From Swiss-Prot, chain A:
Role, per record: Removes terminal alpha-N-acetylgalactosamine residues from glycolipids and glycopeptides. Required for the breakdown of glycolipids.
Annotated source species: Homo sapiens (Human)
Name of the molecule in the record: Alpha-N-acetylgalactosaminidase
Catalytic-site annotation from UniProt: D139, D200
GO terms (BP aspect): carbohydrate catabolic process; glycolipid catabolic process; glycoside catabolic process; oligosaccharide metabolic process
Length: 387, 400
């Protein structure tokens, strides 16, 4: 979407995966969807390095809505958002952050809150702009395909007409199977800054693998459509939650990075472990994710050993490689060379291991190397030519 | 098997899951299958609390064999076991541990090492006893169903005839589909101390779930067969390795305990984290696993919320309860009561949370309670009539 926004993938925090539709503030005040939750997360992002590392969006998901007023104007739940959304936008802005919100193209939100029907699209866009929102995720429950086909373009146009830059995240393709012929990716790129292609992530390794598999199965279609201002979105990071092991957490970060995915966390920033912070705040990893060329990577090799190799092209003749073990036994010594991974001949390279920080220098295409990859884990290199 | 052994489930360490068939000692001396590996693991078991908490077996799996000598006697790989197996058994015994070994009822071991064919069953049994081995796992690759039907009883008879008590772990049912009519559990209970019912565990939560699902699906058949001296074996613990999260690691420990499973670790004890050691060395957890009645537990409740409840009967009218969340979203507040979990009579109970150590007092059947269960995780209670506390302090003694 040609609105000047998200020339690199969005980084931030999104409520949904970890906090879901918990509205029981009487019994669970610390974890319910509420103004307090968002203010506390904003504070952590400001104070604990997140904003400084690039994590700038703080996004509200489903279950914020209270109703519509006599003029049809959307309102937040007054018990859980007592000061209203402008208050929260202003608070987040005072901390150098951006506020995202959520609506549904359809009669109701997925969890049954008031929907943004076709006849409400313009009003709702105007309300969000008036509130000084910075991003909108438009879900697609409780609509027909024809309604979504009218609605998503209508919302892009309505947001534009407000004059406020609002990043636009579109769930449209996920409701239509994610693929041609029903999904038109050139159309999506013209109307959306990012789109959810596929199924919601859940807090499990199986879920991560299911998403990775669908993305890699369809990478010939998906890889070319991503670029500055228009990203594929394989969903939220699980890092900091319950379902991923340490190796798996590091793997998701590396693989989302090579896929030029949004880095939208969804975890309790108030209690996040040092180990998990270190993954998410890895400076080179973020540099790679945020590479200005915005070229989504691909799986380039799959071996009978169950080692997979992904490659992302980067600025300044650099590349990212992710060596990914789908083995479930023990560490594996993977033997390769840059020549076996299709690199340019006669060039000499240097590599930095993104997780260890160690430097491997003087690699020619013919140079044999070994990387040790743990099960359901990765080794990631940032590689560039040297003199 | 009525050989006086494994009146409670075996606890120990088995090389296979973590170290597999790594024989490259030239490139990987610290992690290859070798006498050094076993000696270092024994030292850790003796020094770091494992033995003292009940982990007594240290078991060799596949890939130890060098060949057979001119008389047909098994030899370990001389480059990897330069001192021989008797030396290793002696070393392990000197630390108060027991040594397990591995063979295959078939032409070769699964990784292609010399097989214990029917003609070698007796000789190999005699060799193992002479080496002062304490446990034998008998795998089933490269055999026919008739060879297994002959061989597993033949090995049980051969071990018996050596006069040395050797705990006998039989893979037979895993090669027959794990179920009647092909598997005859009444025979297995008479010839084996434990048996691998089902597929090999791998270092993933999906694997743990697949095994749990199978045991729960078939628990009407499987639960009654387990007891002192004859256990079901759902395979090794994954705690300490790569695939399980913290919540999953605690779940596996709890569920294996409720199932009266062996607690056979397979992890690098030299680098295991304090957090994972704390799960595996939990004294109440181990007490429950080792309960002298040896009654395997069952899943007693499954709810549309994806919370499941398992219960294991214990000594002195105590019970273990595991509340298990198969949810994949966020912590869940599970509301229940003992009455809803088929506790009847007007007994007043107390519970200890096995992981937190917290005590919950004054539970009657009607008492509403809430437990907070994390996704792919558990809450586990040791539950007892409160009158047990008093009665346990009011026993009276006299000299004989
Ligand atoms: C509502 O919708 C409109 C229409 O889509 C948006 O207006 C567009 O905004 C974008 C982003 O600001 C503009 O794109 C930029 O144009 C710059 C100059 O282009 C001039 O020349 C072209 C022809 O060559 C004319 O069409 C145009 O009128 C301009 O006069 C470029 O310099 C920018 O380049 C950027 O990208 C390149 C590579 O991608 C980088 O090398 C640069 O560094 C730089 O980052 C960019 O292309 C676009 O021109 C606008 N179109 C129109 C018709 O006005 C509104 O932004 C939007 N409003 C809201 C609130 O959402
Ligand atoms: C080869 O195979 C034979 C079976 O064919 C095995 O022989 C059995 O060995 C076990 C273990 O040693 C024996 O079990 C023990 O019996 C002891 C004596 O009980 C006798 O007396 C009672 C009468 O009171 C009879 O009912 C009974 O049949 C016996 O004749 C018990 O004292 C032992 O108790 C153990 O367990 C209790 C807990 O339950 C503990 O408190 C005790 O401390 C103790 O550990 C035990 O039950 C069994 O009797 C033998 N059976 C037969 C038929 O002889 C061989 O062991 C096996 N050899 C090898 C090398 O594997
Ligand atoms: C989104 O909401 C609209 C408007 O509420 C839905 O349309 C309405 O749907 C109801 C029933 O769900 C319709 O009632 C039906 O009327 C016919 C008349 O013959 C009757 O035979 C049926 O038994 C039933 O009562 C109602 O007419 C209709 N109203 C309007 C104004 O269209 C729509 O179904 C919802 N869309 C989605 C995608 O969920
Ligand atoms: C287990 O082995 C026997 C014997 O196999 C022979 O010796 C081996 C070392 C190897 O070199 C084999 O190729 C030899 O055939 C197998 O029984 C034989 O089966 C073959 C059919 O493949 C048949 O021609 C012979 O008649 C059989 N020989 C005898 C002595 O019965 C047996 O099938 C193997 N079992 C399994 C489960 O693989
Ligand atoms: C790389 O390894 C291959 C196979 O292991 C070997 O044949 C070759 O000599 C090695 N190449 C170099 C340049 O050392
Ligand atoms: C337990 O909770 C239910 C509501 O969920 C209530 O109706 C019932 O009376 C409670 N029982 C007791 C003993 O407090
Ligand atoms: C594809 C898509 O937008 N899925 C969404 C489906 N609906 C929930 C909230 O109800 C989340 O927003 C989830 O991310
Ligand atoms: C059921 C069974 O014994 N499976 C075994 C299959 N064979 C390997 C060694 O090769 C392991 O021992 C594994 O535990």
């Amino acid at each position: 979407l040609d609105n000047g926004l998200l020339q690199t993938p969005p980084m931030g925090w999104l409520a949904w995966e970890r906090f879901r539709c918990n509205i029981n503030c009487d019994e669970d005040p610390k974890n319910c969807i509420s103004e307090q939750l968002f203010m506390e997360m904003a504070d952590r992002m400001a104070q604990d390095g997140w904003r400084d590392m690039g994590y700038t969006y703080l996004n509200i998901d489903d279950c914020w809505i209270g109703g519509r007023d006599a003029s049809g104007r959307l309102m937040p739940d007054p018990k859980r958002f007592p000061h209203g959304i402008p208050f929260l936008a202003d608070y987040v802005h005072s901390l150098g952050l951006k506020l995202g919100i959520y609506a549904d193209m359809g009669n109701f939100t997925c969890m049954g809150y008031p929907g943004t029907t076709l006849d409400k699209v313009v009003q709702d866009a105007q309300t969000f702009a008036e509130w000084k929102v910075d991003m909108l995720k438009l879900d697609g429950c409780f609509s027909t395909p024809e309604e979504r086909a009218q609605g998503y373009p209508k919302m892009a146009a309505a947001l534009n007409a407000t004059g406020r830059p609002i990043a636009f995240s579109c769930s449209w393709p996920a409701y239509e199977g994610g693929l041609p012929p029903r999904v038109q990716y050139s159309l999506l790129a013209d109307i959306c800054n990012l789109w959810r292609n596929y199924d919601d992530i859940q807090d499990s390794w199986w879920s991560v693998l299911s998403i990775l598999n669908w993305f890699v199965e369809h990478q010939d279609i998906l890889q070319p459509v991503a670029g500055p201002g228009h990203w594929n979105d394989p969903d939220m990071l699980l890092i900091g939650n319950f379902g991923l092991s340490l190796e798996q957490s590091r793997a998701q970060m590396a693989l989302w990075t090579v896929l030029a995915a949004p880095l939208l966390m969804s975890t309790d920033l108030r209690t996040i472990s040092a180990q998990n912070m270190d993954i998410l705040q890895n400076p080179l990893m973020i540099k790679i994710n945020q590479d200005p060329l915005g070229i989504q990577g691909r799986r380039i090799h799959k071996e009978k050993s169950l080692i997979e190799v992904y490659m992302r092209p980067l600025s300044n003749k650099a590349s990212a490689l992710v060596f990914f073990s789908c083995r479930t036994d023990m560490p594996y010594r993977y033997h390769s060379s840059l020549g076996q991974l299709n690199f340019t001949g006669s060039v000499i390279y240097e590599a930095q291991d993104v997780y260890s920080g160690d430097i491997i220098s003087g690699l020619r295409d013919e140079t044999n190397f070994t990387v040790i990859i743990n099960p359901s884990g990765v080794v990631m290199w940032y590689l560039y030519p040297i003199k």
